[PDB]
Amino acid sequence: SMNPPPPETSNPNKPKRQTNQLQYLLRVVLKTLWKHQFAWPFQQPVDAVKLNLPDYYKIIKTPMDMGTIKKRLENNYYWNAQECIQDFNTMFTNCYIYNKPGDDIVLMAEALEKLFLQKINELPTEE
Numbered sequence: 091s092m093n094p095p096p097p098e099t100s101n102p103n104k105p106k107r108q109t110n111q112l113q114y115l116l117r118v119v120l121k122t123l124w125k126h127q128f129a130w131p132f133q134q135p136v137d138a139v140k141l142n143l144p145d146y147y148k149i150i151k152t153p154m155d156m157g158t159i160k161k162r163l164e165n166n167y168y169w170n171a172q173e174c175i176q177d178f179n180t181m182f183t184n185c186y187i188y189n190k191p192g193d194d195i196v197l198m199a200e201a202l203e204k205l206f207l208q209k210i211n212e213l214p215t216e217e
């Protein structure tokens with residue numbers, strides 16, 4: 091089978107705002123995770139065709155990845171910081187769901203999640 095279309099990253103019908111928290115999510119959180127040595131499996135939608143994973147999109151029905159999150163942030167797609175944090179959580183939980191405890195890919199996600207949570211603990215109060 092084909093891959094699904096990627097998640098939406100722009101919708102001109104959606105209102106936009108910039109907030110200090112969304113700025114921090116792009117400029118600090120996403121920038122820090124992106125450069126991590128384990129970030130590469132998470133930087134774009136899973137290409138189940140190229141990776142030969144016929145069951146991936148049978149199991150993962152709410153796909154998410156950092157490439158999508160980056161594009162959402164750069165497009166001002168998100169209104170609330172919590173939408174973006176939810177997308178990161180979806181990405182990490184999808185990894186845990188598809189794979190098994192102690193798999194290398196799971197240890198990679200665990201390391202990125204720990205860093206994510208450290209950076210979110212420093213999320214500035216909304217202004």
Ligand SMILES: Cc1cnc(Nc2ccc(OCCN3CCCC3)cc2)nc1Nc1cccc(S(=O)(=O)NC(C)(C)C)c1
Pocket residue numbers: 130131132136141143184185188189195
């Ligand atoms: C976000 C994500 C979540 N879970 C997975 N799990 C996963 C994906 C592919 C897997 O394929 C096993 C056999 N292939 C591994 C490389 C040779 C053939 C096994 C597990 N991959 C993910 N992303 C991913 C992205 C690019 C490449 C790869 S990979 O195919 O190189 N698989 C890993 C070695 C990283 C597990 C995986």
